[PDB]
């Protein structure tokens, strides 16, 4: 929520690994997202674009080499 505001023995070991993974994930997320849209404009603009998308459809491109033909 803070980000939203502004832009027996074995159990311990497993919980520690889970927490480490959690921290890794939060670090990954901060790096990938907050630097890009430090001002939150990107997400709002995306919301609105999806909402009004149908007014002008469009589609992007990706290379698709023809598959190899073969017989039985």
């Amino acid at each position: 929520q803070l980000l939203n505001k502004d832009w027996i023995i074995s159990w311990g070991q497993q919980s520690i690994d889970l927490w480490i993974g959690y921290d890794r994930h939060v670090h990954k997320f901060i790096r990938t997202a907050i630097d890009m849209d430090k001002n939150r404009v990107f997400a709002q603009r995306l919301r609105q674009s999806v909402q009004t998308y149908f007014d002008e459809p469009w589609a992007l491109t990706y290379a698709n080499a023809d598959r190899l033909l073969d017989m039985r």
Binding site: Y22, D37, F42, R47, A59, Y62, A63
Partner: protein, 205 residues
């Protein structure tokens, strides 16, 4: 004859898998440590080689790789229907959802479907699904299946890694950032869309 580093890289046993994968559209994220490292070491020469095929090699700022054919390409190109683009945009959003962090990046298709119906004009998806449908349960289920088909098509391209033995969950990779190119710039989406067309990113429909 051939640059030394290009020749050395081409002989690398890892090359054929990439060469066949990329020309089928696959985007390469950060996850594939070995493949991504190989591309990092030999970006310049690989770019020079493919440029002889009359196709371009692009490394967007996010850190992924993808192949973009030009007008005179020697390998065909293709596009994807409206529903797939809608699903891609929704996936792009979920990546950014601040409330998501509790989920560590794993998701479920139930959330994907439920969220989608909060934005799109109910009929305006129904018409693409079935003209006669006006909120019936059967046509809602039909759309539920169509979204799964679109998601499989999307995964083949490399936008999401499946997880576990149950299909009802998946993971998102950073290559989805591509769907935001429309809103990348602060100018009017329309002129930006035409600029994207001119750059060859997307063709109008």
């Amino acid at each position: 004859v051939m640059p030394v580093k290009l020749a050395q890289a081409l002989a690398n046993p890892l090359f054929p898998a990439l060469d066949s994968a990329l020309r089928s559209g696959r985007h390469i994220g950060l996850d594939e440590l070995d493949n991504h490292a190989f591309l990092m070491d030999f970006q310049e020469y690989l770019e020079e080689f493919y440029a002889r095929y009359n196709v371009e090699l692009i490394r967007a700022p996010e850190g992924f790789f993808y192949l973009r054919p030009r007008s005179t390409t020697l390998i065909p190109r293709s596009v994807l229907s409206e529903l797939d683009m809608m699903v891609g945009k929704i996936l792009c959003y979920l990546y950014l959802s601040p409330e998501r962090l509790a989920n560590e990046g794993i998701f479920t298709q139930q959330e994907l479907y439920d969220e989608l119906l909060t934005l799109a004009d109910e009929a305006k998806l129904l018409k693409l699904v079935n003209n006669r449908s006006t909120g019936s349960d059967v046509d809602r289920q039909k759309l539920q299946e169509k979204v799964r088909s679109s998601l499989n098509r999307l995964r083949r391209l490399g936008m999401v890694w499946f997880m576990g033995h149950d299909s009802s969950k998946f993971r998102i990779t950073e290559s989805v950032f591509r769907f935001g190119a429309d809103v990348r710039a602060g100018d009017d989406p329309r002129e930006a869309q035409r600029r994207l067309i001119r750059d060859g990113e997307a063709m109008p429909i």
